[PDB]
Amino acid sequence: GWKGEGGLTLTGGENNTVDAYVERAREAERSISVQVRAAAAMSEAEMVGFDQRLKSPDSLKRKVATALAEQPGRNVDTVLAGITAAVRYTLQWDDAAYTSGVATVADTLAGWRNDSVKWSNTWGRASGYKGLNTGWRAPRSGQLFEVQFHTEASKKAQETTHKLYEEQRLPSTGKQQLQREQDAIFAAVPVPAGADSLTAPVP
Template identity: 65%
Template sequence: MRITTKLSRAVTALALSAIVGLGLANGAQAASAQDNTAHPSARSATEGGGWQGEGGLSLSPADNARVDAYLEQAKKAERSISPQVRAAAVLSAAEVIGFDRRLKSPDSLKRKVATSMRENPGQNVGEALARISDSVRYTLQWPDDRYSVGVTIASHTLAAWGNDSTKWTNRWNGGKGYKGLNTGWHAPHSGHSFEIQFHTPTSKWAQEETHKLYEEQRLPTTTPERAKELQEQQDSIFAMVPVPPGADRLTAPRVPVTASRR
């Protein structure tokens, strides 16, 4: 089944204005203000201003300060990103999952940065942060029978509003392991990167069921034998997830010249 969607910039802009008028965007910004106090500095901060995590991961005081500054940038960027994501969800009849967790926690981000620097000797904190695409992240979900159409509408809507598609990882096209569609975007106003995962109820369930297994697998202290065992457990869970019709053929939106950012 081939799915085509034509969305004009004028129509989507009007739709966004209408949705903002209903107070959805204001709600997102109000929630964002609450999040500014919801994530205090990482619990694993050391007395000297550095950061210490599991598995021997750590950040120096200077690197920790750089990550803290990046977290503040993410909070500010989220205030303009969230209204568009929520509007796209309304237009595509998506359920927004875990909206209160749209900002990556300090410990989680610092663990990711420290892991990247450990796995890439010589990499500095700025280079590690440049590879981060999910400090602001969202999950949109549809039932299986509306999934492919919903993804198409939501992604084309975001692209028409000037968000650049930077990553499109479609894991519905067979094979073992993770099922779902993970996408990366570059916001037009803040220039900040953000992630949107497109799921069905079953694929989201599988992701949550395997989360702890995945986290353990990523620890530097996990042995190769244990990592293999953890991967097999994840594969068995994702094998239960059905593929929605047309999901394996979904591709990133191509933005027409008239909708490109000036």
């Protein structure tokens, strides 16, 4: 059995189900990183966070044990079936080649029989985080993975807004005064021409 050291738990029958999923995803990642590093080169994109392209085993179980608490009756099989960011990648660009580079990666992935699950285009928002987080399912392995396309400035937003998330989400001594401090950076982040018009590629 698994012991969530924050008040969480998982039985051995569920624990071995997740550990089998961990090694199972690690096998599909090999064929996925191949198809990802390709488009990252086919569009002159930069790959950051690639050293952590696979989600942590403990962090994976916490999201499962939390989902089990929110929705009993759901088995770990369906809970693991909903995980979207178990394997994940980040593609960077200059603001000039961002929009064209994203369309390349999305089409080359779709052309390789990958399925678009989500398309979180938040560039045309006057307030909030700017970016495009995408969801994909590998063709034969069926593994759900995500790709968040960033710029040098958009990645620097989350590189710096997370420390404000740290002292805002936590009510230790806090709040909304930093809500402007973050949206000031989000407004300071330039939106590439067409970034707010990026749609999921129809396969």
